[PDB]
RNA sequence: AAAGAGAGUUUGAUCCUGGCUCAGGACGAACGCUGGCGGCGUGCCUAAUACAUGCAAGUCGAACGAACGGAGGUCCAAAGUUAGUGGCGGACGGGUGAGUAACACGUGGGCAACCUGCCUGUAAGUUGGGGAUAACUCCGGGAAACCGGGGCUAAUACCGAAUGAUAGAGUGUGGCGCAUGCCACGCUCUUGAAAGAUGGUUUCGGCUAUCGCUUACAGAUGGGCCCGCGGUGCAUUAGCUAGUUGGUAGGGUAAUGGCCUACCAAGGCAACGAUGCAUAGCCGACCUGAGAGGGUGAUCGGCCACACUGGGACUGAGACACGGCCCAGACUCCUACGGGAGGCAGCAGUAGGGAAUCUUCCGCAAUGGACGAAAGUCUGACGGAGCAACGCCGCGUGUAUGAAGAAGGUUUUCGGAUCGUAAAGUACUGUUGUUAGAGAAGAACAAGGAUAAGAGUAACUGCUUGUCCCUUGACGGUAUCUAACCAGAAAGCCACGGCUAACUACGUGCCAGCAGCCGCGGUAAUACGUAGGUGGCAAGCGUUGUCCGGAUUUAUUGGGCGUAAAGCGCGCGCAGGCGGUCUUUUAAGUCUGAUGUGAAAGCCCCCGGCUUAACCGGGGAGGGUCAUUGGAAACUG
């Protein structure tokens, strides 16, 4: 870059893509977790259910998600018990 | 969304429209809803106002600019606007 | 109210048909001769070819790092007005027309299938903890872009907790719709928030003002998707397609959707032109035309696409992002040979292509942007200046008088005619010009100081409104005005046989040459060159290139097919086009009223402002086989 703001944007850039990359990962694995806990067996399952939901309505107040989207995740992983 | 001034006319002889468009369109492109005239040659100012539209806008938030508000200040539209706000 | 001009050319002469040429208007124009000024506009149409040089996007100390005067110790000096992390902006503004024949654009709708920072209003809250990290300082790799390691520290930086959903489920009640479904309200459980900074008062605790931060609900704004209709050449381009066509489940997105996946069936589009090739950004609009139509997309406004070529993602409310990032490709540059940097279709400017296009200028004064509480910083947007008769409009190079007629050219039937009242003389003026001076509007402000009144408060401080005081010009001594002098410093181009306005002489002799056509030139040339004269226009005049007209020469308005070009050799017949008489009924076509919309600018009408005009301003009118809806039923259905 030639520009004196594009350098400070830019390392902002990483920093917010490694914050952003965690958190996701993050919410993604829960959901993960929950999904294989419903599709065999009960066993806590529900009691997973919770955290996960958890996991997206807290990533709405960070930024990196909508709320529709949220919403609707919870929806319809909800269905499966 | 501003109540804005346009400039046309001629080299040297500026005339002003008051309209109101949004702060990232051109100076003299897109607008909304013009409501008035400006002209700044004559030494007594000309400035006609529809006194009607500018309050509705202005309930609407419509912020002004410097000199549009002092137009309104002087014509009354802000007074009234006060009296509204407090009635 | 509007309402249309023709001429030459086939023949020994005619009348028709038919083509060719010319008389008019307009350019982002070019070339030749010439050239005085003022106002308003326009200027790479070709190479989306390659780019020196400078400037075009930064800002916040009210969240964390300055010199001086100067506490203190004749010497050094503590506290008081100025880098970076973080927030906002860089997605606006500005430039090109490559690509694109498609929901890209125009017009009219739908979203009970959607999003939206800043702006406005309302209802609640801003309660408690933690672990770090730049900056800074040491150790190294370093040619240099810069890399790693150790230590140290802040926050409106980051991450948990208390509490709060109209977020998910489960349910109930009532009212409803355009099928899916929408609205009001109630019940139980599970999740999701915050940040403080500048002051005031008080007691100092508290309380409070402004700007701030979190959640929810409306408005406004900007976007997203879907749909009916409309705007090109080729059939010597006839089949194309397979996530294609539909369904059942799922994934994904803000949202619907083969957008994507698995399964099931073989569908779908097409002579009302599918598919393919070629060209091309679209519109408001511009030129022409009596009009219908025809041609084009210069300037300006709206939408779309692109940023050296191709692909991708991050941050963000908004980008798959001109002056942001990663990879590959071509080119330019530096290297210590390990590796690095760049993208003027931004404003000026250079090279190349062209028949052809401008200064490497001034200023944020005005308007508008980004940041901030404000002063204020930035703004090649913009306001201005420079170049080019490139276009439109306006003015001048004098005015009156001056004779059977100055002088001298051109001719002469050698008496004369002609330039010609044109000259000299005569009387007058200064629009321009020279000299010397007075000299505006564009300016509103913002902020700062007093005020007066409101809401809020226990009180303030502050906030909103109103009235005053003070300050601000690149243009620029610019427009403009006042005086003195001066006919002096200011006219050219084309044409003259007919079309078409305007003729004499000399020279030449089918040569030199002219030419849009008829055609002129061989010894008496109004057509070739020159001189005199005359005609048209005028700081312009001619030539060329493109478009429209004339051209009824694609004829709906507005032509034809015996002999001039033009009836298939004839028949049977699918689709299509058209269709005897009367009655009842429908409103698809038809005709009409009302609502919304067809942006601004442009043509047109009426008013104005510049000493007039060009130009500018206000109001009005025009333009649709447009959506909602109410009417009539003669005609077609
Ligand atoms: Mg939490
Ligand atoms: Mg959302
Ligand atoms: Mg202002
Ligand atoms: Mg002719
Ligand atoms: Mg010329
Ligand atoms: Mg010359
Ligand atoms: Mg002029
Ligand atoms: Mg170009
Ligand atoms: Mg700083
Ligand atoms: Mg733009
Ligand atoms: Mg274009
Ligand atoms: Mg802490
Ligand atoms: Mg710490
Ligand atoms: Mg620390
Ligand atoms: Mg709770
Ligand atoms: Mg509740
Ligand atoms: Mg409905
Ligand atoms: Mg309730
Ligand atoms: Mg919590
Ligand atoms: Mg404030
Ligand atoms: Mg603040
Ligand atoms: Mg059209
Ligand atoms: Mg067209
Ligand atoms: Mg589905
Ligand atoms: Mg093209
Ligand atoms: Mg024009
Ligand atoms: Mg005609
Ligand atoms: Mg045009
Ligand atoms: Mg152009
Ligand atoms: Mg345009
Ligand atoms: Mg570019
Ligand atoms: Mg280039
Ligand atoms: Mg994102
Ligand atoms: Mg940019
Ligand atoms: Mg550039
Ligand atoms: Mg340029
Ligand atoms: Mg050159
Ligand atoms: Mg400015
Ligand atoms: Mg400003
Ligand atoms: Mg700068
Ligand atoms: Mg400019
Ligand atoms: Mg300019
Ligand atoms: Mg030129
Ligand atoms: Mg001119
Ligand atoms: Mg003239
Ligand atoms: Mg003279
Ligand atoms: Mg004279
Ligand atoms: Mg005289
Ligand atoms: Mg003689
Ligand atoms: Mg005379
Ligand atoms: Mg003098
Ligand atoms: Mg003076
Ligand atoms: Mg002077
Ligand atoms: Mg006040
Ligand atoms: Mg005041
Ligand atoms: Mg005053
Ligand atoms: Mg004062
Ligand atoms: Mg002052
Ligand atoms: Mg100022
Ligand atoms: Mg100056
Ligand atoms: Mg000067
Ligand atoms: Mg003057
Ligand atoms: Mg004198
Ligand atoms: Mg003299
Ligand atoms: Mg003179
Ligand atoms: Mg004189
Ligand atoms: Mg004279
Ligand atoms: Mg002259
Ligand atoms: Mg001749
Ligand atoms: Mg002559
Ligand atoms: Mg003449
Ligand atoms: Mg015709
Ligand atoms: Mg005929
Ligand atoms: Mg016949
Ligand atoms: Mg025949
Ligand atoms: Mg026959
Ligand atoms: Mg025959
Ligand atoms: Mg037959
Ligand atoms: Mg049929
Ligand atoms: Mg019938
Ligand atoms: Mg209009
Ligand atoms: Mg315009
Ligand atoms: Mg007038
Ligand atoms: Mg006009
Ligand atoms: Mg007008
Ligand atoms: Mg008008
Ligand atoms: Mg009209
Ligand atoms: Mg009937």
């Known amino acids: 870059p030639n520009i004196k703001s594009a350098i400070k944007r ?4 990483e920093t917010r893509n ?10 993604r ?11 065999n067996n009960a066993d806590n399952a529900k009691d997973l259910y919770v955290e996960a939901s958890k996991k997206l309505d807290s990533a709405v107040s960070k930024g990196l ?9 919870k929806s319809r992983l909800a269905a499966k018990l | 969304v501003k109540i804005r001034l346009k400039r046309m006319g001629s080299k040297k002889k ?11 369109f051109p100076r003299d492109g897109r607008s909304i809803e013009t ?3 400006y002209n700044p040659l004559l030494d007594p ?9 500018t309050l509705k806008w202005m309930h609407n938030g ?4 410097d000199t549009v508000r002092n137009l309104l200040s002087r014509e009354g539209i802000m007074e009234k606007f006060h009296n509204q706000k407090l009635g």
């Open chain 2, 35 to 37: 409501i008035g005239t």
């Open chain 2, 62 to 65: 419509a912020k002004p600019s």
């Open chain 1, 10 to 13: 830019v390392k902002t850039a």
């Open chain 1, 65 to 73: 998600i909508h709320k529709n989207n949220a919403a609707r995740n």
């Open chain 1, 18 to 27: 490694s914050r952003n990359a965690s958190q996701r990962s993050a919410m």
């Open chain 2, 45 to 53: 100012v000309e400035v006609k106002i529809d006194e009607e539209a």
């Open chain 2, 14 to 24: 500026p005339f002003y429209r008051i309209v109101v468009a949004d702060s990232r």
């Open chain 1, 29 to 39: 694995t829960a959901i993960k977790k929950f999904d294989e806990a419903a599709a």
